[PDB]
Structure formats: C-alpha cells, structure tokens
Design a protein around this nucleic acid. Structure first.
Ligand SMILES: Nc1ncnc2c1ncn2[C@@H]1O[C@H](COP(=O)(O)OP(=O)(O)O)[C@@H](O)[C@H]1O
Ligand SMILES: [Mg+2]
Ligand SMILES: [Zn+2]
Length: 628
RNA sequence: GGCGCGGCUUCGGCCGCGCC
C-alpha cells in the first residue's frame, strides 16, 4: 500500500532477475510487500498474449486469510484473478479448474500435496512462480518439502516441462543441530538445495536504514539464586500427598487414569496431569467422578500455590490458598470439602509461621527490583512489560510491587494512562522499551534460577552468529559454483529418498483381537476392521455398537471428507475410555477408532501387543466398501 | 480420526504448535 523502502527494492532484485532465491529478513520489516513487488513484476513481464500463474504458500490459516485479502486488494487495478484454497474451501469445488481459472492462488501447502498425490494436478508446470512463506520449514517430511520433492523429481528426473521460479520468505533460515560453523553452512546449503535456491537475499546496502525500523532489543541474562531453605513446599507437598491418597480411595486405579507420567508437585506438568485426569472423568458414575473433580480441584490449587511460593513470596501463596478456602466454605459445602478445608486448617498456623519468617524471603525478587531501579533511573520515561509463568504470579507480582517501598514509582496494571508504566502478563494477548522475562516459559532481561534456560539461550545466540557468518560467506561464491554444489546435493538427497522406499509391509492376515486398553473388555476383531481412504480405521457390525457410547464433540471439525460430530467411549460401568470419534462420512454414520485406545491380544496365545499409530500395525487391512 | 514440525524422554512415550 505505501511507498517501498530502499531495502525492499534491494531485496526484490534477485527474484525479479528470474533467480530462485530465499529472502531472509527480520520479522515485520515487510517481506510480504517484497513478495507483492516480485509477484507484480512476474505477472507483468509476460508479453501480450501470454500469462503467468502465481501460487503463494501460507503455512497457517491466519496468514492464509491475511494474504488472500492483501493480494486481492493489491491486484485490483491489474484485473488479475485472485482466489485461495484452504482446508475449508472444500470440497465440492474442482481444484484443478480453480488453478486453470486464476492468476494468483493462495494455498495451504497440504492442499497442493493432496492434489499432487491424487493426480488431479498433474504438474507444477502449471505454475510459473511459487512463493513459500515461512520457507525455513522446507525440510524433512513437511508439506513444503513434499511439494519440492515433486519439483525436484521433475527437474532431476528429466521430464521437461518448464519449471516454475521459486522464492521463499523467512526471518531465519536457521542452522539445525549444527555444532560448528561448517555444519551450519552445510545445513544452509541443504535448505537452498531443498528449495532449488541459488541466491540468498539479505539486506546489504541499506543496513543502516533497515536498522531504524526493526525491534532488536539489547539482550541481557541474569541468573538468580533460588530460595535457600523452603519449608512451605514441604507442608503443601504433604497436603498434596494426603489429598491424592484421598482421591485414590474412590478411584483405585488413579495412577493409571492419566497418560502423563512422573508428575511433580509444583510444576506445569502436574497441572497438565490434572487436566487430563479431569477430562477422563466426566461429571451413578457421575458421583465418583464429581468427587474426583473436587480432589483434583484442591490439588490444582495446591500446585498453583507451590509455583507462586517459588517465584514470588510465600505470603502470596498462602494468601492465594486462604482466599480459595474462603471461597470453598462460602459456596460449598459438602462432606469432602469440609474434610479438605479442615485438613488445610490443621496446617494453617505452621504455614502462617513459616511465611512471616525473614529467612523465608525470595532473593529473586530483590534481583528483579534492582533491575527496575537501575532502568528507571537511567530513564524514568520507561514502559515495562513483565512476563511471568502463571495467572496467579501476575497478581503476586502486582501486590509485591504496590507494597514495595523501593518501587513506589511504578504504577502497575494487568492484562494506561496517567499511570501504567509496567504491565504484568502471561502471553502477549513493541512499544515497550524494557522487556523482562521473570522466570517465563530497547532492552530485554531474562531472569531465571534455571541455568539450563540460560545455557540454551546462549546456544541460540551463538547459532544466530553461525547462521549469519555462513550466509555472508555463501554470498561471496560465484553463482555457477554454488549451482553446481546445489545440483549434486539434490542428486544425493533424491537417491536417498528413492532408495529408502517403504517397502509395502505385507500383512499378517491372521485374526487378532481388540480390547479397551483401560478395562480390557472386548471391543472387536481385526477381520471386522475396514480402512477408509488409506489412513482411517472403522469397525463393521452392530455387535460393536453395544461396546461404545457416543457423546457430542466439544469441537466438531470438518476434516477432509469426514464430519466429526461425536466423541466415542467404552460402554462399560465407568470405564469410558476415549475410543475415538463418530463421523458422518459421505452418507454414513460410522465410528472412527484410534489404535492407542486398545490393547491388541492374540486369540491363540494371550500375549498383548501395543500400538501407537495404525501405520505400525501390520494386519490384513481390508479396504472399506460401503454396501456391507 | 489422520498428517507435519518442535521440546522433553525411563525409548513405552509425554507435552506443545499447527495442518487436512
Ligand atoms: N515500506 C513500508 N513502509 C511502511 N510500512 C510498511 C512498509 N512495508 C511494510 N509495511 C507495513 O509493516 C508490516 C510488515 O509486515 P510483513 O511485511 O508481513 O512483515 P514480515 O515480512 O516480517 O512478515 C505490514 O503489515 C505493512 O503494512
Ligand atoms: Mg512475510
Ligand atoms: Zn473399557
């Protein structure tokens, strides 16, 4: 929409000269505009009586929509036809002819992947230009790389057939698991080879101009020491062991109700354990599961508390708990809750003692405080964003600030104007000169007690430098030499790809059995299992329908050719294991099951085999026929 | 349901972000 910056002009040059190029430029510097310039040029270069055809790949839906609107709006004067296909722009719309009848097409990559496989789009020769957004994803088995495997099979396999020009956009080509500066460079050449790029476009002549429009904060690291003696954790942990023991009383097999393993009190993974346990027990069986929901609620609160105590001050954790229980005994208040609240009360005074103890303060907070003093002394006109781990840590930090004499110059608020200069939050849901990551996940401070976090961070910094040095070096090579290297890397990768064919599994045609992984009851047999479109597995017969119950899906999805309309579970007395889903498929109401919800058992022997994915299950897979 | 990519892994997986 607005007038091109000089670096944008510079970045679009190699592409406009027809070269396959990767445009590597910082986020928000305007690569999409560069792609608009390249696209405009590409379509305009064709003499009257010919046409180009441009395809643009967005890896995600929001990007897809944004660029559909942007490319549509930009190309109105030109009169070019602009449409796009997403997983929703389906399915009774003939894709081949949508490509025939358009000039610019925005695709999610999987769509091209599918139609290429199904033969409905015979060749990428239908395109004259392919633009890959987030092009650093063009590796391994990713959709981008499937598309490029098709390209390269056409280029190398000698089936010509003109090929389209290929350009990619990224903010970072990356280096992978490179340890030295030569492994990094080799990875980069591998990326170029995947995309058939012979040119990497970086800003070289307008650096000092690009610099002015880019958020590149000064990155700082302060490792902070965790609390020396912590007796708050010990007490709360004992409460959690207690209530877990209570929850096991109404649910014997509690330790096996969740897939999540080796939970630790006061961690995020414990929270995740909570969530999976609660979605496994849905509110006669409602009584057991409701009680279970109570226990796991209190366990959730305790987990929260531990985390608060870890990163804020024990007073904050204990306040949080006190308020929670004040809520419980003011909107409850049946036996289990009275019992739980009492068990808390029996420890309340010791917790109370341990909290107000000077030895039990958090030095981490002193560190953060210090950073705030210094920075607001160097510039009191400073706007800060303070990232914390949990919702509760937001409030803990806010109270801590409002009640800290040394920070009486900060007017805080959570997610302006006469007084809000620091905002505490969890996710970003740019105008802030000071960014602080206080135990999370222009200046930027990372504060953590975890040396591993810092280690990884310094590793990523070093990687960035290896990447930049490597690109710089690459760009000095004559294009011919580089194309020759690219050629032979591509030849090599192609050989590996074709040599490492499957081969077809050859099935064990013997009848095996299928039981609910949880309660081991008879679900069905393998001879009763049909495959729908290569990848989906259903079961035949009414005898199977007595073994599952249906229950409306939280989020109905319209995927491929199916219509997910229900979640399905075991029918037993309070198993209710997640078996899979129920779909409307074409005209049929059928169940679709996942192999991870079943134990396979050999009928003759009794041994039990376990399978994560149907890909790994090698049985006489009978193709599904409707009239049965 | 299935696929892809990441982070951990007791290599049994677990989790996260996406896509069809
Ligand atoms: N030359 C320019 N002058 C002013 N604003 C621009 C210019 N180029 C891009 N912008 C704006 O800045 C934003 C950059 O976004 P985008 O180009 O998609 O960034 P990225 O290339 O990192 O994805 C765009 O939304 C655009 O509206
Ligand atoms: Mg972009
Ligand atoms: Zn069951």
């Amino acid at each position: 929409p607005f007038k091109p910056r000089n670096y944008q002009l510079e970045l679009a040059l190699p592409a406009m000269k027809g070269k396959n190029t990767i445009i590597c430029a910082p986020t928000g510097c305007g690569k999409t505009f560069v792609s608009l310039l390249i696209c405009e040029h590409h379509l305009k270069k064709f003499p009257q009586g010919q046409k180009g055809k441009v395809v643009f790949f967005a890896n995600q839906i929001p990007v897809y929509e944004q660029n559909k609107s942007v490319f549509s709006k930009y190309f109105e004067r030109h009169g070019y036809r602009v449409t796009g296909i997403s997983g929703a722009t389906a399915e009774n719309v003939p894709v081949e002819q949508i490509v025939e009848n358009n000039d610019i097409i925005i695709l999610t990559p999987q769509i091209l992947v599918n139609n290429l496989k199904k033969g409905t789009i015979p060749s990428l020769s239908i395109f004259t230009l392919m633009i890959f957004d987030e092009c650093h994803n063009t590796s391994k088995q990713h959709p981008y790389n499937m598309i490029m495997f098709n390209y390269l099979d056409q280029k190398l396999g000698g089936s010509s057939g003109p090929l389209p020009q290929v350009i990619g956009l990224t903010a970072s080509v990356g280096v992978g698991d490179a340890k030295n500066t030569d492994e990094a460079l080799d990875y980069i050449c591998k990326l170029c080879a995947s995309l058939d790029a012979s040119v990497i476009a970086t800003v070289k002549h307008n650096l000092e101009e690009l610099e002015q429009v880019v958020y590149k904060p000064q990155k700082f690291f302060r490792k902070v020491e965790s609390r020396i003696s912590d007796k708050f954790k010990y007490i709360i942990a004992q409460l959690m062991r207690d209530t877990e023991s209570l929850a096991k009383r109404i649910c014997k097999d509690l330790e096996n109700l969740s897939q999540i393993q080796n939970r630790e009190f006061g961690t995020q993974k414990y929270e995740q354990w909570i969530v999976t346990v609660q979605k496994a027990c849905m509110v006669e069986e409602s009584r057991i599961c409701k009680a279970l929901f109570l226990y796991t609620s209190h366990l959730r609160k305790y987990n929260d508390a531990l985390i608060i105590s870890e990163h804020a001050r024990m007073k904050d954790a204990l306040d949080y708990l006190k308020d929670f229980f004040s809520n419980v005994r003011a909107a409850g208040f049946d036996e289990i809750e009275q019992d739980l609240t009492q068990r808390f009360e029996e420890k309340l005074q010791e917790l109370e003692s341990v909290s107000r103890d000077p030895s039990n303060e958090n030095p981490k907070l002193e560190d953060l405080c210090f950073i705030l003093q210094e920075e607001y002394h160097l510039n009191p006109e400073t706007i800060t964003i303070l990232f914390v781990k949990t919702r509760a840590l937001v409030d803990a930090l806010k109270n801590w600030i409002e009640g800290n004499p040394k920070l009486s110059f900060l007017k805080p608020g959570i997610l302006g104007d006469h007084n809000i200069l620091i905002a505490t939050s969890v996710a970003d849901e740019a105008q802030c000169n000071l960014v602080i990551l206080y135990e999370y996940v222009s200046k930027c401070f990372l504060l953590t007690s975890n040396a591993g976090v810092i280690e990884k961070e310094q590793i990523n910094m070093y990687k960035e430098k290896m990447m930049n040095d490597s690109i710089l070096r690459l760009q000095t090579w004559d294009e011919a030499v580089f194309r020759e290297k690219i050629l032979h890397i591509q030849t090599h990768e192609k050989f590996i790809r074709d040599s490492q064919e499957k081969p077809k599994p050859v099935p064990d045609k013997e009848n095996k059995k299928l039981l609910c992984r949880k309660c081991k009851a008879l679900a069905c047999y393998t001879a009763d299992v049909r495959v729908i479109e290569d990848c989906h597995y259903t079961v035949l017969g009414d005898a199977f329908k007595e073994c599952f119950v249906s229950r409306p899906h939280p989020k109905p999805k319209q995927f491929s050719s199916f219509e997910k309309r229900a979640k399905i579970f075991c029918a037993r007395q309070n198993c209710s294991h997640d078996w899979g889903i129920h779909v409307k498929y074409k005209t049929f109401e059928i169940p679709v099951i996942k192999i991870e919800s079943f134990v396979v058992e050999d009928i003759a022997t009794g041994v039990q085999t376990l399978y994560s994915k149907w890909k790994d299950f090698h049985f006489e897979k009978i193709p599904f026929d409707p009239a049965e």
